[PDB]
PDB file of all heavy atoms in Angstrom:
ATOM      1  N   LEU A   1      -0.855   4.933 -18.965  1.00 17.61           N
ATOM      2  CA  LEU A   1       0.072   4.014 -18.530  1.00 17.61           C
ATOM      3  C   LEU A   1      -0.471   2.928 -17.633  1.00 17.61           C
ATOM      4  O   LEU A   1      -0.192   1.802 -17.783  1.00 17.61           O
ATOM      5  CB  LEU A   1       1.231   4.681 -17.842  1.00 17.61           C
ATOM      6  CG  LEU A   1       2.390   3.874 -17.452  1.00 17.61           C
ATOM      7  CD1 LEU A   1       2.958   2.971 -18.686  1.00 17.61           C
ATOM      8  CD2 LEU A   1       3.501   4.731 -16.951  1.00 17.61           C
ATOM      9  N   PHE A   2      -1.326   3.320 -16.753  1.00 18.25           N
ATOM     10  CA  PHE A   2      -1.892   2.464 -15.859  1.00 18.25           C
ATOM     11  C   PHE A   2      -2.839   1.468 -16.472  1.00 18.25           C
ATOM     12  O   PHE A   2      -2.738   0.240 -16.194  1.00 18.25           O
ATOM     13  CB  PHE A   2      -2.961   3.242 -14.875  1.00 18.25           C
ATOM     14  CG  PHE A   2      -3.440   2.513 -13.735  1.00 18.25           C
ATOM     15  CD1 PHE A   2      -2.676   2.378 -12.572  1.00 18.25           C
ATOM     16  CD2 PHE A   2      -4.647   1.808 -13.862  1.00 18.25           C
ATOM     17  CE1 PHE A   2      -3.184   1.531 -11.455  1.00 18.25           C
ATOM     18  CE2 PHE A   2      -5.137   1.008 -12.719  1.00 18.25           C
ATOM     19  CZ  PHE A   2      -4.393   0.919 -11.604  1.00 18.25           C
ATOM     20  N   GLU A   3      -3.595   1.900 -17.467  1.00 22.46           N
ATOM     21  CA  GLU A   3      -4.408   0.921 -18.237  1.00 22.46           C
ATOM     22  C   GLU A   3      -3.608   0.027 -19.210  1.00 22.46           C
ATOM     23  O   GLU A   3      -3.979  -1.170 -19.233  1.00 22.46           O
ATOM     24  CB  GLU A   3      -5.366   1.802 -19.214  1.00 22.46           C
ATOM     25  CG  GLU A   3      -6.725   1.407 -18.943  1.00 22.46           C
ATOM     26  CD  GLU A   3      -7.205   1.654 -17.579  1.00 22.46           C
ATOM     27  OE1 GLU A   3      -6.618   2.504 -16.865  1.00 22.46           O
ATOM     28  OE2 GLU A   3      -8.272   1.039 -17.067  1.00 22.46           O
ATOM     29  N   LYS A   4      -2.437   0.604 -19.651  1.00 24.58           N
ATOM     30  CA  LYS A   4      -1.534  -0.224 -20.477  1.00 24.58           C
ATOM     31  C   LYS A   4      -1.090  -1.339 -19.671  1.00 24.58           C
ATOM     32  O   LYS A   4      -0.863  -2.551 -20.110  1.00 24.58           O
ATOM     33  CB  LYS A   4      -0.423   0.719 -21.026  1.00 24.58           C
ATOM     34  CG  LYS A   4       0.424   0.119 -22.022  1.00 24.58           C
ATOM     35  CD  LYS A   4       1.520  -0.851 -21.445  1.00 24.58           C
ATOM     36  CE  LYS A   4       2.242  -0.318 -20.190  1.00 24.58           C
ATOM     37  NZ  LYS A   4       2.937  -1.350 -19.320  1.00 24.58           N
ATOM     38  N   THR A   5      -0.836  -0.988 -18.440  1.00 22.87           N
ATOM     39  CA  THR A   5      -0.227  -2.053 -17.404  1.00 22.87           C
ATOM     40  C   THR A   5      -1.353  -3.038 -17.018  1.00 22.87           C
ATOM     41  O   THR A   5      -1.085  -4.351 -17.111  1.00 22.87           O
ATOM     42  CB  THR A   5       0.249  -1.353 -16.126  1.00 22.87           C
ATOM     43  OG1 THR A   5       1.397  -0.543 -16.607  1.00 22.87           O
ATOM     44  CG2 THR A   5       0.692  -2.309 -15.106  1.00 22.87           C
ATOM     45  N   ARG A   6      -2.452  -2.578 -16.699  1.00 23.55           N
ATOM     46  CA  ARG A   6      -3.568  -3.563 -16.270  1.00 23.55           C
ATOM     47  C   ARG A   6      -3.931  -4.557 -17.187  1.00 23.55           C
ATOM     48  O   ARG A   6      -4.129  -5.723 -17.005  1.00 23.55           O
ATOM     49  CB  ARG A   6      -4.804  -2.662 -15.944  1.00 23.55           C
ATOM     50  CG  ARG A   6      -6.074  -3.439 -16.105  1.00 23.55           C
ATOM     51  CD  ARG A   6      -7.334  -2.445 -15.875  1.00 23.55           C
ATOM     52  NE  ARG A   6      -7.560  -2.130 -14.479  1.00 23.55           N
ATOM     53  CZ  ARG A   6      -8.313  -1.155 -14.060  1.00 23.55           C
ATOM     54  NH1 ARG A   6      -8.883  -0.318 -15.014  1.00 23.55           N
ATOM     55  NH2 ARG A   6      -8.519  -0.844 -12.806  1.00 23.55           N
ATOM     56  N   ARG A   7      -3.883  -4.135 -18.542  1.00 19.71           N
ATOM     57  CA  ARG A   7      -4.296  -4.979 -19.627  1.00 19.71           C
ATOM     58  C   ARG A   7      -3.132  -6.098 -19.818  1.00 19.71           C
ATOM     59  O   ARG A   7      -3.390  -7.184 -20.191  1.00 19.71           O
ATOM     60  CB  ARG A   7      -4.526  -4.183 -20.847  1.00 19.71           C
ATOM     61  CG  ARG A   7      -5.894  -3.636 -20.781  1.00 19.71           C
ATOM     62  CD  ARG A   7      -5.951  -2.393 -21.822  1.00 19.71           C
ATOM     63  NE  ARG A   7      -7.384  -1.971 -21.892  1.00 19.71           N
ATOM     64  CZ  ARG A   7      -7.736  -0.761 -22.261  1.00 19.71           C
ATOM     65  NH1 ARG A   7      -6.752   0.083 -22.703  1.00 19.71           N
ATOM     66  NH2 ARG A   7      -8.952  -0.363 -22.342  1.00 19.71           N
ATOM     67  N   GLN A   8      -1.882  -5.693 -19.510  1.00 20.71           N
ATOM     68  CA  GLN A   8      -0.743  -6.599 -19.726  1.00 20.71           C
ATOM     69  C   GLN A   8      -0.900  -7.642 -18.571  1.00 20.71           C
ATOM     70  O   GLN A   8      -0.968  -8.915 -19.076  1.00 20.71           O
ATOM     71  CB  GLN A   8       0.490  -5.801 -19.428  1.00 20.71           C
ATOM     72  CG  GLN A   8       1.631  -6.160 -20.398  1.00 20.71           C
ATOM     73  CD  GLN A   8       2.975  -5.462 -20.149  1.00 20.71           C
ATOM     74  OE1 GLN A   8       2.975  -4.214 -19.887  1.00 20.71           O
ATOM     75  NE2 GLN A   8       4.137  -6.058 -20.283  1.00 20.71           N
ATOM     76  N   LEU A   9      -1.180  -7.303 -17.416  1.00 21.66           N
ATOM     77  CA  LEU A   9      -1.264  -8.286 -16.378  1.00 21.66           C
ATOM     78  C   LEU A   9      -2.406  -9.249 -16.444  1.00 21.66           C
ATOM     79  O   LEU A   9      -2.427 -10.268 -15.786  1.00 21.66           O
ATOM     80  CB  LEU A   9      -1.270  -7.542 -15.103  1.00 21.66           C
ATOM     81  CG  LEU A   9       0.015  -6.789 -14.710  1.00 21.66           C
ATOM     82  CD1 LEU A   9      -0.135  -5.930 -13.374  1.00 21.66           C
ATOM     83  CD2 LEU A   9       1.143  -7.702 -14.489  1.00 21.66           C
ATOM     84  N   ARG A  10      -3.385  -8.897 -17.196  1.00 18.44           N
ATOM     85  CA  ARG A  10      -4.647  -9.771 -17.433  1.00 18.44           C
ATOM     86  C   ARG A  10      -5.178 -10.160 -16.100  1.00 18.44           C
ATOM     87  O   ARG A  10      -5.598  -9.380 -15.289  1.00 18.44           O
ATOM     88  CB  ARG A  10      -4.370 -10.932 -18.226  1.00 18.44           C
ATOM     89  CG  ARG A  10      -4.419 -10.702 -19.708  1.00 18.44           C
ATOM     90  CD  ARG A  10      -5.657 -11.370 -20.343  1.00 18.44           C
ATOM     91  NE  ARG A  10      -5.273 -11.969 -21.652  1.00 18.44           N
ATOM     92  CZ  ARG A  10      -5.950 -12.906 -22.084  1.00 18.44           C
ATOM     93  NH1 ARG A  10      -6.831 -13.597 -21.417  1.00 18.44           N
ATOM     94  NH2 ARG A  10      -5.506 -13.435 -23.313  1.00 18.44           N
ATOM     95  N   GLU A  11      -5.236 -11.525 -15.949  1.00 16.90           N
ATOM     96  CA  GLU A  11      -5.909 -12.054 -14.633  1.00 16.90           C
ATOM     97  C   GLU A  11      -4.930 -12.420 -13.617  1.00 16.90           C
ATOM     98  O   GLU A  11      -5.334 -12.921 -12.502  1.00 16.90           O
ATOM     99  CB  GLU A  11      -6.672 -13.290 -14.983  1.00 16.90           C
ATOM    100  CG  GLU A  11      -7.893 -13.015 -15.941  1.00 16.90           C
ATOM    101  CD  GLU A  11      -8.975 -12.118 -15.327  1.00 16.90           C
ATOM    102  OE1 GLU A  11      -9.445 -12.406 -14.205  1.00 16.90           O
ATOM    103  OE2 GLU A  11      -9.158 -11.134 -15.998  1.00 16.90           O
ATOM    104  N   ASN A  12      -3.670 -12.064 -13.678  1.00 18.82           N
ATOM    105  CA  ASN A  12      -2.608 -12.381 -12.700  1.00 18.82           C
ATOM    106  C   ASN A  12      -2.476 -11.251 -11.618  1.00 18.82           C
ATOM    107  O   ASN A  12      -1.816 -11.518 -10.560  1.00 18.82           O
ATOM    108  CB  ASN A  12      -1.268 -12.432 -13.513  1.00 18.82           C
ATOM    109  CG  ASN A  12      -1.405 -13.430 -14.620  1.00 18.82           C
ATOM    110  OD1 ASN A  12      -2.378 -14.112 -14.872  1.00 18.82           O
ATOM    111  ND2 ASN A  12      -0.232 -13.666 -15.317  1.00 18.82           N
ATOM    112  N   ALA A  13      -3.093 -10.160 -11.855  1.00 21.31           N
ATOM    113  CA  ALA A  13      -2.920  -9.113 -10.799  1.00 21.31           C
ATOM    114  C   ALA A  13      -4.354  -8.488 -10.450  1.00 21.31           C
ATOM    115  O   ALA A  13      -5.396  -8.657 -11.176  1.00 21.31           O
ATOM    116  CB  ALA A  13      -2.087  -8.044 -11.270  1.00 21.31           C
ATOM    117  N   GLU A  14      -4.431  -7.652  -9.509  1.00 24.12           N
ATOM    118  CA  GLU A  14      -5.658  -6.920  -9.121  1.00 24.12           C
ATOM    119  C   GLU A  14      -5.361  -5.466  -8.666  1.00 24.12           C
ATOM    120  O   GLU A  14      -4.297  -5.129  -8.170  1.00 24.12           O
ATOM    121  CB  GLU A  14      -6.254  -7.696  -7.889  1.00 24.12           C
ATOM    122  CG  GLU A  14      -7.006  -8.943  -8.241  1.00 24.12           C
ATOM    123  CD  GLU A  14      -7.762  -9.575  -7.026  1.00 24.12           C
ATOM    124  OE1 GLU A  14      -8.564  -8.752  -6.340  1.00 24.12           O
ATOM    125  OE2 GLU A  14      -7.677 -10.781  -6.683  1.00 24.12           O
ATOM    126  N   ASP A  15      -6.272  -4.586  -9.160  1.00 21.55           N
ATOM    127  CA  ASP A  15      -6.057  -3.158  -8.877  1.00 21.55           C
ATOM    128  C   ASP A  15      -6.381  -2.780  -7.351  1.00 21.55           C
ATOM    129  O   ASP A  15      -7.542  -2.950  -6.947  1.00 21.55           O
ATOM    130  CB  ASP A  15      -6.950  -2.314  -9.807  1.00 21.55           C
ATOM    131  CG  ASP A  15      -6.787  -0.843  -9.515  1.00 21.55           C
ATOM    132  OD1 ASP A  15      -5.852  -0.404  -8.826  1.00 21.55           O
ATOM    133  OD2 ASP A  15      -7.684  -0.111  -9.968  1.00 21.55           O
ATOM    134  N   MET A  16      -5.470  -2.449  -6.591  1.00 20.53           N
ATOM    135  CA  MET A  16      -5.627  -2.224  -5.186  1.00 20.53           C
ATOM    136  C   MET A  16      -6.375  -0.802  -5.033  1.00 20.53           C
ATOM    137  O   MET A  16      -6.632  -0.537  -3.813  1.00 20.53           O
ATOM    138  CB  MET A  16      -4.286  -2.211  -4.402  1.00 20.53           C
ATOM    139  CG  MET A  16      -3.668  -3.607  -4.510  1.00 20.53           C
ATOM    140  SD  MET A  16      -2.272  -3.661  -3.358  1.00 20.53           S
ATOM    141  CE  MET A  16      -0.752  -3.518  -4.590  1.00 20.53           C
ATOM    142  N   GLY A  17      -6.454  -0.119  -6.071  1.00 22.03           N
ATOM    143  CA  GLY A  17      -7.169   1.211  -5.929  1.00 22.03           C
ATOM    144  C   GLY A  17      -6.349   2.484  -5.611  1.00 22.03           C
ATOM    145  O   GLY A  17      -6.864   3.568  -5.462  1.00 22.03           O
ATOM    146  N   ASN A  18      -5.051   2.337  -5.538  1.00 22.77           N
ATOM    147  CA  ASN A  18      -4.078   3.350  -5.259  1.00 22.77           C
ATOM    148  C   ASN A  18      -3.001   3.524  -6.310  1.00 22.77           C
ATOM    149  O   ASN A  18      -1.836   4.142  -6.101  1.00 22.77           O
ATOM    150  CB  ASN A  18      -3.415   3.163  -3.890  1.00 22.77           C
ATOM    151  CG  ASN A  18      -2.908   1.783  -3.764  1.00 22.77           C
ATOM    152  OD1 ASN A  18      -2.342   1.225  -4.638  1.00 22.77           O
ATOM    153  ND2 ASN A  18      -3.206   1.232  -2.510  1.00 22.77           N
ATOM    154  N   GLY A  19      -3.254   2.974  -7.548  1.00 20.32           N
ATOM    155  CA  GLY A  19      -2.254   3.101  -8.583  1.00 20.32           C
ATOM    156  C   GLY A  19      -1.329   1.886  -8.497  1.00 20.32           C
ATOM    157  O   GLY A  19      -0.452   1.741  -9.427  1.00 20.32           O
ATOM    158  N   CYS A  20      -1.521   1.006  -7.642  1.00 17.49           N
ATOM    159  CA  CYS A  20      -0.624  -0.323  -7.496  1.00 17.49           C
ATOM    160  C   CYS A  20      -1.407  -1.479  -7.842  1.00 17.49           C
ATOM    161  O   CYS A  20      -2.634  -1.601  -7.526  1.00 17.49           O
ATOM    162  CB  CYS A  20      -0.242  -0.425  -6.054  1.00 17.49           C
ATOM    163  SG  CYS A  20       0.677   1.066  -5.251  1.00 17.49           S
ATOM    164  N   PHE A  21      -0.698  -2.408  -8.457  1.00 19.42           N
ATOM    165  CA  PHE A  21      -1.254  -3.678  -8.895  1.00 19.42           C
ATOM    166  C   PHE A  21      -0.669  -4.744  -7.950  1.00 19.42           C
ATOM    167  O   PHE A  21       0.566  -4.749  -7.743  1.00 19.42           O
ATOM    168  CB  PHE A  21      -0.980  -4.051 -10.298  1.00 19.42           C
ATOM    169  CG  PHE A  21      -1.644  -3.257 -11.304  1.00 19.42           C
ATOM    170  CD1 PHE A  21      -1.024  -2.129 -11.854  1.00 19.42           C
ATOM    171  CD2 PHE A  21      -2.920  -3.671 -11.747  1.00 19.42           C
ATOM    172  CE1 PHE A  21      -1.618  -1.436 -12.771  1.00 19.42           C
ATOM    173  CE2 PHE A  21      -3.627  -2.847 -12.698  1.00 19.42           C
ATOM    174  CZ  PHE A  21      -2.849  -1.768 -13.240  1.00 19.42           C
ATOM    175  N   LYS A  22      -1.617  -5.639  -7.377  1.00 19.22           N
ATOM    176  CA  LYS A  22      -1.066  -6.719  -6.574  1.00 19.22           C
ATOM    177  C   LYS A  22      -0.983  -7.915  -7.475  1.00 19.22           C
ATOM    178  O   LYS A  22      -1.890  -8.510  -7.967  1.00 19.22           O
ATOM    179  CB  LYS A  22      -2.089  -7.024  -5.465  1.00 19.22           C
ATOM    180  CG  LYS A  22      -1.582  -8.106  -4.498  1.00 19.22           C
ATOM    181  CD  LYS A  22      -2.645  -8.361  -3.405  1.00 19.22           C
ATOM    182  CE  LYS A  22      -2.401  -9.608  -2.561  1.00 19.22           C
ATOM    183  NZ  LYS A  22      -3.401  -9.681  -1.552  1.00 19.22           N
ATOM    184  N   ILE A  23       0.354  -8.251  -7.829  1.00 18.77           N
ATOM    185  CA  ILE A  23       0.591  -9.361  -8.750  1.00 18.77           C
ATOM    186  C   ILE A  23       0.494 -10.640  -7.887  1.00 18.77           C
ATOM    187  O   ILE A  23       1.254 -10.778  -6.955  1.00 18.77           O
ATOM    188  CB  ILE A  23       2.004  -9.181  -9.412  1.00 18.77           C
ATOM    189  CG1 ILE A  23       2.045  -7.902 -10.076  1.00 18.77           C
ATOM    190  CG2 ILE A  23       2.132 -10.346 -10.351  1.00 18.77           C
ATOM    191  CD1 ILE A  23       3.367  -7.511 -10.834  1.00 18.77           C
ATOM    192  N   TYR A  24      -0.458 -11.605  -8.183  1.00 15.59           N
ATOM    193  CA  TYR A  24      -0.555 -12.705  -7.397  1.00 15.59           C
ATOM    194  C   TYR A  24       0.328 -13.940  -7.772  1.00 15.59           C
ATOM    195  O   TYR A  24      -0.098 -15.183  -7.715  1.00 15.59           O
ATOM    196  CB  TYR A  24      -2.016 -13.239  -7.475  1.00 15.59           C
ATOM    197  CG  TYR A  24      -2.958 -12.457  -6.593  1.00 15.59           C
ATOM    198  CD1 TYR A  24      -3.402 -11.230  -6.985  1.00 15.59           C
ATOM    199  CD2 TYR A  24      -3.503 -13.077  -5.439  1.00 15.59           C
ATOM    200  CE1 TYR A  24      -4.281 -10.460  -6.144  1.00 15.59           C
ATOM    201  CE2 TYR A  24      -4.378 -12.269  -4.605  1.00 15.59           C
ATOM    202  CZ  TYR A  24      -4.651 -10.978  -4.982  1.00 15.59           C
ATOM    203  OH  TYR A  24      -5.485 -10.366  -4.092  1.00 15.59           O
TER     204      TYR A  24
END
């Protein structure tokens, strides 16, 4: 699920290392 999400967000977000994405 995490990976499915990361790939969706592309270059708009960053993995903070705790399972959360910082959407810029």
